[PDB]
Amino acid sequence: ANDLLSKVKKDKSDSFGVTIGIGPAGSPLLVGVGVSHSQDTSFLNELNKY
Amino acid sequence: GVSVGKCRGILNEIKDRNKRDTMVEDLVVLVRGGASEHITTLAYQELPT
Numbered sequence: 001a002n003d004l005l006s007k008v009k010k011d012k013s014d015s016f017g018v019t020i021g022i023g024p025a026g027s028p029l030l031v032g033v034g035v036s037h038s039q040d041t042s043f044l045n046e047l048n049k050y
Numbered sequence: 051g052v053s054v055g056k057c058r059g060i061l062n063e064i065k066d067r068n069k070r071d072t073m074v075e076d077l078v079v080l081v082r083g084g085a086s087e088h089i090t091t092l093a094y095q096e097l098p099t
Contacts, residue, residue, distance in 0.1 A: 003068045010061055016054045 004049035012041035 020033035081092060 001070050005066055006064050008062055008064055012059050014057045016056060018052065018054055020051055 002050070005047070007046040007048075009045070010041075010043035012039075014039040 015038040017037060018033070018035035021031065022033075023030040077098065079095070079098065081089065083089070084092065
């Protein structure tokens with residue numbers, strides 16, 4: 001009798017966001033900048049032999 | 051303003067198990083001497099008693 005098993009799982013996550021605000025005054029001025037990013041990675045593998 | 055966040059994750063796991071076992075047994079008899087039904091009943095290959 002022989003048994004073989006292998007079950008592996010992989011998970012990855014990443015997220016980043018940038019915010020910038022610039023304004024000259026003296027004639028008031030305003031500039032807004034918004035950045036958002038998100039990354040997710042998931043992997044699943046299972047092997048079984050008998 | 052400047053801000054940026056970096057995150058990285060990784061997981062790995064493997065489990066393995068195997069088992070093997072065998073057992074063999076034999077029995078041989080040897081009878082010489084006897085023609086009547088007594089030795090015929092004793093010639094039963096099926097309990098060495």
